[PDB]
């Protein structure tokens, strides 16, 4: 299962 | 940035026996950036039905891909892989040697 | 089979001439690919690549699709932000790469987690082994580090890498047991190749093995030899197994002095091959 919900931008 | 030229191996899935169906593989690895063109060739002509793996990368961030197709080796037919990449001035051809 | 891992790989490549970045995501359990997403594919869904994941239901695939699309949008934003942190033209294509995942030991309990990010093929920012702090490679990434510390990104990843990632790895290992818990020991043989009347090459082959980790070593009279040897990079067969060979050049007639030693998870004791023919 992938990480969620939404990876923070750089 | 860094441009890294591809390493190339050309080989069969199974030990090659003349007249027996097999798979021909061209494994390109160690390259960056990811855009690359790879064809498999039979007596110098591009083979049409070639498939490839989904792009992934190694610990050093360099990319790798497997290109492959069904083939039937013979004593006379010559096979090879032709690769172009921003790091190459002209396409590179590596011939299949069935002992490698 | 021993320790295991689950890892996700993401690549985004900008397309300055027209359109959105190309985005490709792949997931692995050990050395087995099990899911893909490709922005250039027609489904616009996370897709199965192994038989044991096809039984997940529609809530699974919808969730995975939602999350991997969100990753793709983050990377799009990041391509833009990074062109700016680096003062680069709008004309060139650039690359973001991210990899994260978890390892479990033979007891299937958490061993380690990781999260690494790269821009143009070089390290940008990575999670340290404690899962609490970050390594930033340059001053752009140091600004990202401060932002991610304020947003508590490492707390959220840590909970995923110790929690969810391990839990679903274990579910996959169970569901995929016929293959994922099977080790395929290398099928080994040696060949011989006369170069001249006085020297010959011996090639030790390891075929059809899984996982990909393997060691091939030559010895002469019981001591390791690296001179006059050659080792190819381990390569995929295309059926899920791997291949490798190692070779040595020897004085013809002296082949019997030389031994190939093969170490692999699938071999309770290492194998020793000798040209006795």
Numbering used by the authors:
A (entry chain C): 1 to 10
B (entry chain B): 0 to 99
C (entry chain A): 0 to 276
Can you list sentences taken from the study reporting this PDB entry?
We also solved the structure of each unligated APL to investigate whether structural changes occurred before or after binding — which, combined with an in-depth cellular and biophysical analysis of the 1E6 interaction with each APL, demonstrated the molecular mechanism mediating the high level of cross-reactivity exhibited by this preproinsulin-reactive human CD8+ T cell clone. Competitive functional testing revealed that the preproinsulin-derived sequence ALWGPDPAAA was one of the least potent targets for 1E6, with only the MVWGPDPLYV and YLGGPDFPTI demonstrating a similar low-activity profile in MIP-1β secretion and target killing assays. First, the 1E6 T cell could still functionally respond to peptide when the TCR binding affinity was extremely weak, e.g., the 1E6 TCR binding affinity for the A2-MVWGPDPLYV peptide was KD = ~600 μM. The weak binding affinity between 1E6 and A2-MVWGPDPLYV and A2-YLGGPDFPTI generated thermodynamic data that were not robust enough to gain insight into the enthalpic (ΔH°) and entropic (TΔS°) changes that contributed to the different binding affinities/potencies for each APL.
We demonstrated that the TCR from the 1E6 T cell clone bound to HLA-A*0201–ALWGPDPAAA using a limited footprint and very weak binding affinity. Here, we solved the structure of the 1E6 TCR with 7 altered peptide ligands (APLs) determined by our previously published combinatorial peptide library (CPL) screening, 2 of which mapped within human pathogens. Concomitant with our global analysis of 1E6 TCR binding to the APLs, we observed a common interaction element, consistent with our previous findings, that utilized TCR residues Tyr97α and Trp97β, forming an aromatic cap over a central GPD motif that was present in all of the APLs. Ligand engagement is dominated by peptide interactions, but hotspot-like interactions with the central GPD motif enable the 1E6 TCR to tolerate peptide residues that vary outside of this region, explaining how T cells expressing this TCR may cross-react with a large number of different peptides.
